[PDB]
Structure 1
Amino acid sequence: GPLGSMEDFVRQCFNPMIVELAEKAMKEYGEDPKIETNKFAAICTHLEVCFMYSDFHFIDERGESIIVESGDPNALLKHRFEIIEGRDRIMAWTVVNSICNTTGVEKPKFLPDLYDYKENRFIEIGVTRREVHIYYLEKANKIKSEKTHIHIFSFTGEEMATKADYTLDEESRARIKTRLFTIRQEMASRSLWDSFRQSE
């Protein structure tokens, strides 16, 4: 079929909030979304997975973890996750320092993606177009800090997580995998996938 533009794919297939946050992130690092387009799409995808990982997960009045998918969570519930990704560098470290001084949890050396108030740990989310194990190993080597939990998704449904602890229920992680499958399939119909995959 005809080759589409990755720009078009991104703007048509990700929520505008995600696209804007990705643009802001690339600007901050001196990267042009209109030239590093596979990167733009990868940044959107990862950001979306971070949001999806956190979506609908609360902690109840009794202090326990619950899932609320209706868009009307009662006011006494607290979000289970803090989202660190998507924030500019100053605000991200501000949020991390806050958590670390509050919870007593040690300070990471690089910004992680989420903080889990149930499991009391930072999470690094990975999304890879390669084998999850190789990618798990790469993230781990950069982290070097036994505290941060790593959770890797691929575009083909494989996951790998620290100590085989997957944090979330199967249905939550299936939502993420279904979304990644949808992204891959749509890129493929626009003849964007092979390149996108190979560029990692």
Structure 2
Amino acid sequence: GPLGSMEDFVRQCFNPMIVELAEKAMKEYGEDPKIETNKFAAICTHLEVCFMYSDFHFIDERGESIIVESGDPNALLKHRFEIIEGRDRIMAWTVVNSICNTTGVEKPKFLPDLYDYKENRFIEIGVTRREVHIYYLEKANKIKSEKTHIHIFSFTGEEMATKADYTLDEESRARIKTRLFTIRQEMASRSLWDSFRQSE
């Protein structure tokens, strides 16, 4: 088949808000989306996974964790997750320090991706084109002292999470895996996958 551009794929297959946040992140990282295009797609994918991980999850009027897949959650419901990824540096740390000084949860040394108000911990989300256990170790070694819970997804459906604690129900994680499969399949149809996979 014809070779598409990764740029075209990103703009056509991710929500514009995700794309914009990804562009802003790369600018902050000092990287040009039009040159580091595999990176651009990876950043969009990881941001989307962070959003999907948080989607629909609330803590109810009684303080238990519930899933509300409707458009209207009751106004007394609080979001279960704080989302850290996607914020600029200053705002991301502002949100972290707030959570920390508020919950007593110690300050992480690197920005994590989410905070889970049910499990009372930060989460680092990983998305990898390689085997989950290798990527897991890489994340953990960067994290060192671990308060922060790690959850890794691969494009082929494997997962690895700290202490075999996967946080979410199967259906939620299935949504994420289905989305990753869709991304891979679409990339493949445009002949972008092999390089995207190899570039990690």
Q: For the residues of structure 2 that align with 1:191 and 1:146, how far apart are their CA atoms?
A: 39
Q: How does 1:11-50 map to 2 (within 5 A)?
A: 11-50=11-50
Gaps in structure 2 of 5+ consecutive residues: none
Deviations 1:70-98 (A, max 9, x none): 01001000000000000000000000000
Q: For the residues of structure 2 that align with 1:71 and 1:65, how far apart are their CA atoms?
A: 18
Deviations 1:48-73 (A, max 9, x none): 00000000000001100000000100
Deviations 1:96-137 (A, max 9, x none): 000000000000000000000000000000000000000000
2:187 paired with 1:196? no
Q: Give identity over the alignment, percent.
A: 100
C-alpha deviation, 1:30, in angstroms = 1.1
C-alpha deviation, 1:146, in angstroms = 1.9
C-alpha deviation, 1:145, in angstroms = 2.2
Runs (4 or more) in structure 1 with deviation over 2 Å come to: none
Q: For the residues of structure 2 that align with 1:145 and 1:97, how far apart are their CA atoms?
A: 18
Q: For the residues of structure 1 that align with 2:193 and 2:40, how far apart are their CA atoms?
A: 14
Deviations 1:143-179 (A, max 9, x none): 0122100000000000000000000000000000000
CA contact (8 A) 1:184 1:193 kept: yes
The SS at the match of 1:66 is: strand
TM-score normalised according to structure 2 size:
1.00
The SS at the match of 2:30 is: coil
Q: For the residues of structure 1 that align with 2:148 and 2:36, how far apart are their CA atoms?
A: 29
Q: How does 1:142-181 map to 2 (within 5 A)?
A: 142-181=142-181
TM-score normalised according to structure 1 size:
1.00
2:86 paired with 1:58? no
CA contact (8 A) 1:108 1:145 kept: no
Gaps in structure 1 of 5+ consecutive residues: none
CA contact (8 A) 1:57 1:67 kept: yes
The SS at the match of 2:176 is: helix
Q: For the residues of structure 2 that align with 1:30 and 1:161, how far apart are their CA atoms?
A: 30
Q: For the residues of structure 1 that align with 2:145 and 2:70, how far apart are their CA atoms?
A: 36
